[PDB]
Symmetry: C2
Subunit: 367 residues, 2 copies
């Protein structure tokens, strides 16, 4: 009998990466001025977004099934480890089946391959369960539907890390200039290319700050969570699904970004993505507050010491993105400036959150 922590952690990392890499087809979508007014390319972009969401949810379902299985397994062995590796191999091939299905929906080949993959996952999991029940010592103590917190945490961490890596790869792809381009612009001057590419560098830091602050909010939330209910897990899955779309909002090399579009439209899309990513974390927090005794620690109970702090932590980004979208809709003049100011201000608010909470609550109490 061996400990099963590392095996499940590796499974979580693999599955998170597999679920998050479904956004790449969306990022690489190409639209040009010649095809700007064509309907097919717009419909294709929309369908690709939908496909990304569906594939993310499928991979998440598979991961949850694996977690429920290894909650009963408990202790792993060499045989069970190899069988879990086979199950991971089977799950990883789902992306290819869905790619085939997307390329050829009417043809039944992709459907058959997807069904065969699901059936292989099923038989492998059934073999693992039968092996564990055959040998009592392997099973968990309780045997011999809240999901486990550690698994959810690992999956979320993997998703966020992959998003950040996508951002930095986009920077590495776009910002670097070519020798011929440098020579044509100026007489072999790279300082000038740096001067021309600085805003891109700063936008990268802004995007990474956004992702890191969202992760910080999620981490602070799950630190205070005694138990994670199934509803909280579903809301977390939705939040992660909409977190995977951040590259679509904060990428320059992406063919998606390189299309005829107005600045206000890009700002609106990015704000909507951020709001959708953060509102589901806020919903997790509220749902946990409903059943505070079981799903939360005493500190974050209603009227607790850190309740207001956590509420502000999780409501900072949603309210800010909603304000940015409202400014885009109403003012129509300073929207981009408001969005950039918010991008650079939300970090500062996070760093000084406790002092702001204190001063605000004190001022409201006095008056």
């Amino acid at each position: 009998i061996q400990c099963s922590q590392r095996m499940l952690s590796f499974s979580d990392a693999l599955l998170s990466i597999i679920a998050t890499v479904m956004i790449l087809p969306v990022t690489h979508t190409e639209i040009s001025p010649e095809q700007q007014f064509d309907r097919s390319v717009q419909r294709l972009l929309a369908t690709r977004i939908a496909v990304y969401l569906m594939t993310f949810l499928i991979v998440t379902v598979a991961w949850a099934a694996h977690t429920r299985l290894f909650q009963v397994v408990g202790k792993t062995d060499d045989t069970l480890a190899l069988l879990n590796l086979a199950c991971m191999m089977t799950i990883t091939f789902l992306p290819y089946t869905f790619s085939l299905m997307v390329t050829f929906p009417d043809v039944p080949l992709g459907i058959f391959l997807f069904c065969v993959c699901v059936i292989a996952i099923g038989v492998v999991q059934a073999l693992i369960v039968g092996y564990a029940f055959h040998f009592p010592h392997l099973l968990s103590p309780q045997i011999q539907e809240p999901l486990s917190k550690e698994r959810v945490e690992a999956f979320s961490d993997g998703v966020y890390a992959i998003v950040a890596t996508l951002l930095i790869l986009d920077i590495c792809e776009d910002n670097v200039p070519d020798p011929k381009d440098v020579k044509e612009r100026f007489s072999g001057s790279l300082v000038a290319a740096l001067s021309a590419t600085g805003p891109r560098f700063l936008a990268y830091f802004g995007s990474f700050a956004t992702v890191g602050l969202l992760w910080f909010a999620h981490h602070s939330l799950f630190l205070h969570v005694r138990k994670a209910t199934r509803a909280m897990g579903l809301l977390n899955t939705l939040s992660l699904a909409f977190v995977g779309g951040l590259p679509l909002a904060y990428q320059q090399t992406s063919a998606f970004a390189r299309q005829p579009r107005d600045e206000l439209e890009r700002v609106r899309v990015s704000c909507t993505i951020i709001f959708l990513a953060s509102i589901f974390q806020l919903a997790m927090w509220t749902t946990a507050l409903l059943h505070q005794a079981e799903t939360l620690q005493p500190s974050v109970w209603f009227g607790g010491r850190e309740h207001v702090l956590m509420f502000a932590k999780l409501a900072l980004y949603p309210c800010a993105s909603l304000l940015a979208f409202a400014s885009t809709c109403l003012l129509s003049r300073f929207s981009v400036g408001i969005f950039h100011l918010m991008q650079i201000a939300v970090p500062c608010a996070f760093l000084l959150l406790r002092l702001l909470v204190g001063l605000a609550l004190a001022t409201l109490r006095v008056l």
Copy 2:
């Protein structure tokens, strides 16, 4: 005061992904028949491999510095969490500095940016240390150079997962056919395209099996390790660095693979990569055996119950790849067949390792 497990796990995941994504430039290298005999493209491929190795080692050094720092920190706070996120942001920008340096080595801009990034990492880490020492409660109990095992495990898991994801992405990119291609080959027949693309599907399973079995060996090794010495950490870093090259060996869409080359040369390259990946794990095992009392559990001591099993587990792949290379060099006729037979046999040997060890040792004892 808050627990620092999840923060460090997220840092490990991010840094592992960042270190492993340095292989992508190598995979996307293009060589054509027109430029087959040109020296520049071959030299470029070699230099890109070297650059990948160097960048991996740099990111690993940064990760090790962070681990040594947070061994003293112990307990994290909101401020320390945000500062660690800033440090991760700074480390993630190293890829871009190195890309600029590669594109323009003679120009000093990339060098200056790299130095500034290192200096920013330094100042952020110094601020974290001063903050922790300013507040005694945050520091670890021991304060108020063996690396931590959990961090190494997480980093290795991330690297392996990213390799597997690269493999599956390569499959998704190449194997899927286009509608026009299907129509030109046959009268709208996708079953025929499947029949033509089957060997690629099977090669994917072979490559994933290779990666998963290497991970299984590493996991079995670290399960029995009481303490991880600095030398073992360095050997693990080298093993991971040479594991990142597996995509170069098991990818079809990669422009690297799409070049004029003989089958025997590809087999030799893949075998060399696998041998280099596994021999360093074997070296970790031997180095730990030297100081068995401190670096190993009683089971794997010399003459232990699981010593022979672990030795076989960690020597299966090195010996097999060496045999495949020797067959390539000597026989020159059935080398590819031997390589494929080995690819599909090593998994079976892993699954039946205990029975083979038993029968072999018994036969040797009797005779």
